[model samples]
Target: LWDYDFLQSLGRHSSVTEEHVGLAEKLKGEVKSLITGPMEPLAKLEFIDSVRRLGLKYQFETEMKEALANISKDGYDSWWVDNLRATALRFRLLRENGIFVPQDVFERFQNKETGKFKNEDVKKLLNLYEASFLGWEGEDILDEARTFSTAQLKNVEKKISSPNLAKIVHHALDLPLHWRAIRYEARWFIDIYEDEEDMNPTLLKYAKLDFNIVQSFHQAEIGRLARWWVGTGLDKLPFARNGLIQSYMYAIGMLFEPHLGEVREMEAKVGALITTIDDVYDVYGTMEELELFTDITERWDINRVDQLPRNIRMPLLTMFNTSNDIGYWALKERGFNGIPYTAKVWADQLKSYTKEAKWFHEGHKPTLEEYLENALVSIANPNLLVTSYLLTVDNPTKEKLDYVDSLPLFVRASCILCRIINDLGTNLKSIQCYMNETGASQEVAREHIEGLVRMWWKRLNKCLFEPSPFTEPFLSFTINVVRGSHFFYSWTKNQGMSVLIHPITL
Candidate 1:
């Protein structure tokens, strides 16, 4: 729990300055030349990777895309045999940027009969390890890549690689680069990059200035959100999670670009509202009160909730007002009325929450499939993603709404990862349901659910490559929902204070 007054004081003195902007501008050009300049392919890839890892990719997207295009056109046949590290890095960046590179590219490194990788170089294995997480379903080579590198890197001390590589190994083994929240990974990498023997001073300076500047923007946005949260009066509720900062973390996780502050602020509010209502359903509300809560939410009515407790009543009012506030803005900004869509998602979430509460009250153990059918929405991703799409897109459409409503493959994949990782981190019905249905031990259930997570990640990877109704921004929101979940569940590093509160030492 944090103090509201203290939150209000965040970023009160901005850390960015005109001199910082001028320095960043000059550095941006230097990095652009490094990308487009005459350099070795490996060196170019490293520079581009640094630009991205340092969170300066937004400033050099076109240059990076052009660089990757030339690299992709240069053909892996020329370089795949001699360089595992370069090959893996190239494959990862290409795939992540939506360029096509097949998994069979790594087949050359594998022995024909044994079907195992031959290399034991920690640096190469480390790069391969991070790249393997981008695998799609049925690509057993990537699976083998993951298994092989994981085994090798699990005890990288035996190899006695450079400490910079060791630091990276620890971080990747904690979570793959593909699976991490991009902003947090950037923040972490900025520090690590500075320690590299070949670290570029220009890039390091740019990253620190850019990170602190962005952090200043984030602080101001969250400060405003803190004030808004204080106004909602839901902060006083004993049962709810005091999660304003965490909610803002999720917002940044979705879209952390400096220019998208409006979407960030709105998404944070949605996250906070979801947390409070989730508490009412999970912790405090009686069955009858929950039913009334569902009804009130479905009808979007605040007046008729007088029979509900203050805790229940307050969230409904906040939800009601927040939806209208977003709806009015959408209409004003985009000429689209979003009230019905916003209302429907909340109603859908409440209905799912009601179903779970009903099962718990009746002492029923739903089968895994049966449980997930309701549990996915209950995880609150679909609601969050739908609303995020509404905010992120330039012009919302009925067709896209229908696609989202159908719970398309990408959304489903994200929800599964979100729900299960959340369950593994803090299990209630998911693990218990699996164990009850299968007569398995807790360890077995946990392992099985983790397999489900891996499988869904494959499915998500597949979806990313396929054509979809959603655009890049909305698709990123869906993807970042999973990233945010991973960060929230597995985080131990400073509890995201580095990203949210403390600025980089400029």
Candidate 2:
């Protein structure tokens, strides 16, 4: 069923295949003298192919080493070369094998075992390989060979190092944030198609194009975010920021295209709802106010009446009651809660915020028991409140049991938000760090900034070029938001601060 045109399309579309062919051909000629001197022509051909493939793999492995070497030799100014080389190598390796283990796999491996190979062995191997390949040997060819060899050793070290318990836990906890972000960002394309389908055919096409532009902008911003997160920025924070932004992109993608099937839409919607609620609590309401609001909602009953401020009571009651209804609707739509992660996280954050707020509002010290009880009641519904009280609250002296019972809800919420916040903060911070570290002259940085924008524009072109069943208005709205956000950084320093300092002499 596969035809020449399709194959040609594949070749044209695939950078990996193109690179592989180019590299294979180049190697075929270069290694010919070394390989053919000992073998027949046919044998030489086979040997060339085998060596080319292995060399491709090794080259891929050594990419980071190459980049690091480029940086050392050429100065930090050559970071782009390092980035391109590393990315190309990664792409080549993945293309050849069709499977690749991430760096985190090694972290997991290192966590499992503690002695000999676990401790000194992995570090020694990493140091040895980094020095061998990236180090500047007298001969250029030898240096290249050493770098390639070092890359292979680095890969081996990763495999060997991945067995420590601490490493395993770190990877297990961190991996979802990365994978989830990728999956979410991919949804932007889907959003574009959906928006286009909803518009007039001609207009739809144009709209899709615009949407692609927005997507392109996000991707470019995110790529820069990623480099800073992984490189010099890693020690600055523990959580992955770039991953989160990428996840936001993934969420956008799922909202529109929905490659994961209909069920994922439910997840996406729930995520949106949770984000909205969190925003409301964090951005709009004070901690005390939110706690009071949560408590009133938990105890709310239409049959009963209580005197309350209209401004506070109306919105609070309406939002909470509607949220409860929405929760039921979501369950009906998806056949499950659909977002335990969001719920748990929100609940825990709400509880923490409530406790802190209550203490601040009352202007007095409160026992741990008092804070816990109030927070628990605020978050729980009437039914849960009674049950929780009977099981945990009644036993004041049995602190351990009470703590154990209440922990599940708090922990579930804390764990999820910890991941979310970690990602968001990391991404924002990394981008800022990259901009600062590169020390690119303002003009050069501005040019790179433009390049970032253009890269996103290209991505937008790709999306627009494809047709789909979504609406244009929604696409337009999403695009506008993305574009506006992209230029927001310009304002924070260039405009906002200037205005603040000058004050107009009024």
Candidate 3:
């Protein structure tokens, strides 16, 4: 293993001094008590909003649930409808906490005389536009809000007098907070909050110290993962995307909480393997080589390492062994074995990947239905979610695994969302397969896939509220994975020059 040699090369990490840890823990206790303390309904909602924007709401989820349940019973601010800012802010907080709010709440703010929104406040327009990102499919009001608020935001930002508000408008317009990565949001939010007249000194201090302290924790994990990537010898392997950094970014995006140290490390390695495996069929391996890979994935025999090509033998063995490491940890920590389950999912991925490669190699075109059935699995959520659940969730049972095996309706829906975004574009992706199969025009196919992406988000939103064996944390991770897809691949049509958030690697 390359890492065996590189382990000595990893940089040393400084100890997490006792004071910062103590300070962080104390601040968390204070913050927690503050949220649960008696307060008016307006303060309650504002506290919830602040914790979320401060990127600390994950710490207070249970308290938030109880708080929201009480608010759901009482209803909106009596004047919530009359004011644009209050309406969207209240609507966003309620919707984000598992309660859906109707968009008609905004109807009163629109100009009845002129058939347009009243341009009374720039701040209100900005919040409403940001809030519009959370609605489900065909919420015509949200759609209208998206168009109306975006236009108003564009008209107002240049004329705004304050630098602080201008920067906030620009950032929100670039990408709504709901779609941005949590870690990314926290890094920026700290600076913005520090300058605010309304910002609390105690919360701002905690947020900063916590972020820097967590940076060390993140770097230590990154150092170790970097060493592991070396051990995989992926850099020496030509034709695959050198994606260790990309993999680590994906892991962090999915679970950025500080206490998730062990799971984060496991998932970074998992993401690294996913990208590397994705390459085997998509890039270098011959059809016959892939068949051998798939055969062993299904059959899962160590002795077969010798059966692959000489160059691929070591890499192939590493993948198998890496998977076993995850399985071994799962078994050692919890009294269940998921190796068989995971191995088969890998087999399914390989089968699906190989199927795509075979069709391409042979000039065979699959219909939209045929392509999607296989393409969805090849997207990697099935394998990633199961492996992640095993790492993060405590003591998963046969019953839980059964629910996973049923494909957890949400998981499939997420994969489709990922599939739709990743494929079908001005340049052509999964839609190309559809076009080739059905002889549809690119315009028609792209329009159809875009429609599906929206519909599936609506489906995935519904999945969040449905009963399932999976825990809330696991479900949250699944949803974030879908969001990660949008973060990376979302692009506007034909012009080909949308604002791109450069990832760790290509």
Candidate 4:
């Protein structure tokens, strides 16, 4: 065995110095002036977008909105109407900010002569690919743009000599910025921005300082969660997936802002609990043991500990305690008892696990629809969304909770995508499930699932674009959860999980 370093340092050298503070504050104002002070509509839009892409939007969201709203009023077909890059950028930014810009803007990008696309401009093509992600169902223009740009970009990637351009294309084609978790995206973009040909030194420096500050906060938060996880006997189980760091990873994925520390804390614990219990169902337990564990989960009573085998006793009780602890905080923080509801989520999740386990043991070949319907809930995302919403929202109304209770499209889309992605990388992938149901060859099944994955991503985009009752911040946590699923589930061979003692290169 090799000695591994978890590397808890999030790349910080020192605390924010007076000099760093001075620069961050000054740059914040200067950037604000640059966006709000403004010269022309396009210039303002590009600058606000630059701020957003640099992961600094939290600093100037109100102003960015004012500027973005103003741009939306002009509509894309009017100003900067002919340029494909500008129009696509306008569409993406507007739709992401909840202004519904029709896909008609992209109609300009198509060839009027041949009635087909020609890939003459890569920069415009790249923006089009990025914009295509904001599209809703049945928007053929954006869909065509996605297909055309993706194909064109793939061809350009091979011939392009500019290493920088290649890198950008490779990253986006691998996964668009919209699907990436903001913190990870920010950490990555900071380096890329610093190397830009026209990089603003102040913006670069402030972004670095801000990154360090945020990284430090994240570092401390993960370390504290590490101690808590260690204290929980659940982490002591030998066979389970011990990923306290990665658990914290998803929580951070849910909300990267420093202020959501409380939410992150809950999110980390909840993630840890879910992953461990998942191991019990997926890896360790026998059918009989799993049945007992499922029953215990349904009851959620401490007295039920005697019901599970001694092998599972600690895992069950600790997870129950951890979950109840989250409930206590929910009640304490929100003046409500979401505990019963949260406990039921756990029960439902366990029931889903039992169904899958039973299927595996019975050698049952379920239909594609049946397998998907069962396995989607088994992904265990619904409860995570509920918990995240409860913890992060400033004040979630009963109506909003009702929307969440319905497992609204936004949350459901994410969970389905997550399940698909998890299936893509996992051994018993959806491909296998489909193959079992359809009796198709491995390659054919894989292809079908891949297409399904793309469709589900568009479905997620649809959810994000459609209006919803939840607060933006709350919705963002679930969306970010979808984003992180791409990252965590993308790796297979169990690369994404490690003990807090060591990160195994996820």
Candidate 5:
């Protein structure tokens, strides 16, 4: 009766008064409180009692008729009201009689959405009735009921809020950047799998897992970062680029948290390798000097002691040998026939990028755009072996049996370290600059950089520490080499002239 009267009022009024509309909105809150707040306990008991007194068959039939009419006239809103009333009534009846609905019946009713129900109000009433009775029965039942209720609330909230759809569209568009990173990383591991076939199954499995975990974390982090970026009006900052990258990084970092132990171990190994290689490349060494250190690489069957400079021989040899060992280990763990193919792809990418890098490095008065493009090309496509190669080979020739044997060790090491820094600093700087060029504020750019750094450290740490059971040894070695090289390279670059290059005479 009350439901019918409400619908009739809506129809007769044509345009509901502000007071009436406000009251309708207020009713949603009141009903929500009845279900979730302190009053819920008493209201639930009363609802059950009422149903018992009215008798199941009679009360259900009467309510069904009224609910159908209300829904036929008022649409979804009417269905919500019907649910509140029916649940309240059924709860009273159930409490009075101490009887509960069967599991299948409860589920059937709960699963049926109001929109799908031919008589929306009646369907909602059935669900609400069952939910109220089950919810008050005990903790387990209550938990299930709460879950169902939460889902329902979410649907209702969405309809009522109708948030800016453009925001959702924007988020959808930005999702691919993070996804590309995941795909690249996965493909990298897949390529390594070809050489070592032994660890193929493990590498493949974990690579997939890594992709899933990282993607999930990325989505969540993007949401948080996006909120902050928008809420704080940081987009107005001069340097603030798009919030998408920052969000992506934050998400990646969060995902890496669970795998920190493995990450740290990998970092240690990469650090060691990097340090060893940088030591050889930072100085001028003759072929004879390099031969003394060639023992380090002899284990990997890549000895070119006669080709190195006196200053860079030891470190370059060590760096090159260590990298090969890491690759060998990875192949041993992940046995895929395509390891060589993957390696070649990575090498090719690095080589292609380096060509542009060389042009930029040798150019006079390069523009920021040229510098950025060169740095991006160089850093974006680095492979484990190429990183090692960069640290050991000063100059590479197409005819060289081992590319690392063709260059001065110092030049190679500088290339490796510079690549890492350029990727971390220059690429991100470019992104910020892009944002600024497009009207983003300086503060926005700073925020984006901060976010990118956070992401970089997180990803670096994840790569370093979280070696899956199968790739643990390989990943561990790679991390040691990379980190060690990074530290050494940074230190040497700061020292200035540690790497003496001939000035180009124009």
Candidate 6:
């Protein structure tokens, strides 16, 4: 754990200037016209891909929509015949934007006799591997697409020529573009884009400048969050993790657009509060004490904090005050008093935490399904997403509120991914339950959990194209939470510095 002084000291040294801002604006127009204006359909797909990888997608949502719609209307199988990479890239970018392309489009590249992809070009194979992840259940072609592309990419070292291409293949093999966090991937791709053979100088310039400009917003928001966090004095608690910087990074990972500052702060506060309460259940407190804490949380009363241990009172009050603040803001800004919804989620989390603690302390094991019923809520993804809906929606209607509260596929899929991945990275909840219930070895249990991760992603991909009561932007908040789970579980070092503290060079 970093010291409180050290955590507060973490921030960006460089600043975003008006000149950088003005230049980014100019370059954004030029880049937008290029993507939206005129070019070969294949070339436009590549440009859109670059723009998104550079974190400029938010600036060109309409342009991308119109362009992809136009490109999808093209009826020429001739163009796609020999261009495997372009075909797969088009399929992926369109699906990402909620435009559907069929999975059988790749059948042309397969050999009739062998039932395998014919083109083993490393670049082509890499794109095919990435495109395969957008598949849902019963998409046999994509299943084969993944199996073949993954096998080929693993042995790519001897078959590859360019070092840059090799670097990309290895990185993709580690984690594909589909599952990566947007801001972190943008930070990574901006550096790698400079060395590409067809890289656009203006696009590269704008990505770097815009990333720093965005980073400046995050730095300011996190700094403000730091002041509030320090005031809470949760750091003084001995049993919990002291991670203000990490909480802010989790918030940024979930949604990184510059204008969504209010959502980001609320998400970060929720993340910090979840961690402290989680520690109180998992690490400290006797069973009797935990029962007391859970009861007070259910009541949602700060005055009852006297029933808790002296050290535990502040965290509950902090939770109480933060929930009230959010509820007050929602009523003032959106004409909705959302404290009941917010309070329900917090209480539910504490209840789930207490359940799991009971299982652990009592030496009782639950089946996988039984454990997940409670573990999903305990993981806190729903809690965060519920907070997001309250903050992001303009008019919180009965339909939208009920749909969100019902744990729609998007929310369920997001929670499953976060929970299973957290289990794999630090498993006990799922793996132990699976092993004990099925009488399987730990190794087999891990494989089953990994299979669940893959299966849920398919469900999530299908949800992206389907209609939802939530707006597309709100839907993205759910997807970003899943993407952030990959980063959170992966053993990457200094990821906090990469996205939040550090800036890309000019």
* Number of backbone collisions per candidate: 0, 43, 2, 0, 77, 0
Model 5, 336: alpha-carbon shift in Å?
3.5
| Rank order (by lDDT, best first) | 1, 6, 4, 3, 5, 2
Q: Each candidate: what lDDT?
A: 0.83, 0.32, 0.72, 0.72, 0.34, 0.82
lDDT by residue for model 3 (362-481), tens: 887777777788878887778887777777666688677756755757878877777777674221257887787777887897877776876787677667766776676788888788
Model 2 per-residue lDDT tens digits across residues 156-269:
544553344224223223221112222122222223323322222322233223233333333333333334223422212322222223233333422232122232222322
Which clashing pairs does model 3 show? 2-231, 3-231
* Candidate with the larger TM-score of 3 and 4: 4
| Global fold similarity of model 1 (TM-score) | 0.96
lDDT of 5 by residue, 75-162 (tens): 3333223344444344324322323323232343333554221222322432442343223223243334434543554445444432
By lDDT, who's the top model here?
1
* Span of ten consecutive residues with least summed lDDT in model 3: 494-503
Model 4 regions lying over 4 Å from their true place: 1-14, 40-43, 75-79, 112-114, 394-403, 437-444, 490-506
Rank order (by TM-score, best first): 1, 6, 4, 3, 2, 5
How high is the lDDT of residue 3 in model 6? 50
Q: Give per-residue CA lDDT, model 1, range 1-506, as digits (tens).
A: 26788887775788778988898788878878877887778878788888888778778889899888887774655865567898898888898788988898898788888999985377688789988988898989999999989888886656665877777878888888778888988988987998998898887887888888888888889779888988887777785555777778888888899788997898889889888889888888888788889998888877787788787888888899999999777788877788888899899999999888888878888899999999899988888888777776767777766678678888888987898888887724789998988889999989899889888988998898898777868888888889888888824437667787787886
Off by over 4 Å in 1: 74-77, 158-161, 490-493
For candidate 1, the clash count comes to 0
Which candidate, 3 or 6, has the higher lDDT? 6
What TM-score against the true fold does each predicted structure earn? Answer: 0.96, 0.29, 0.85, 0.89, 0.26, 0.95
Model 6, span 354-394: residue lDDT tens = 88887877888888998898898999888999889988897
lDDT of 4 by residue, 1-506 (tens): 11112333332343555776777788778777767774566666666666777678887889888888777663544666878878888788888887888887766667788655655577788888998887777887777888888899998889987777678889999888888777667766766766667566766666776766666666667656766766775555665444666677777667778887877777788777788888888888888788888887787766767767766777788777877888788788887666776787888889988888888778876777777777778888888887777765666556656577567667777788788877776625577778877889988888888777667777877766566666667767767887888777523223322212222121
Q: In candidate 5, what residue range of length 10 has the lowest lDDT sum?
A: 497-506
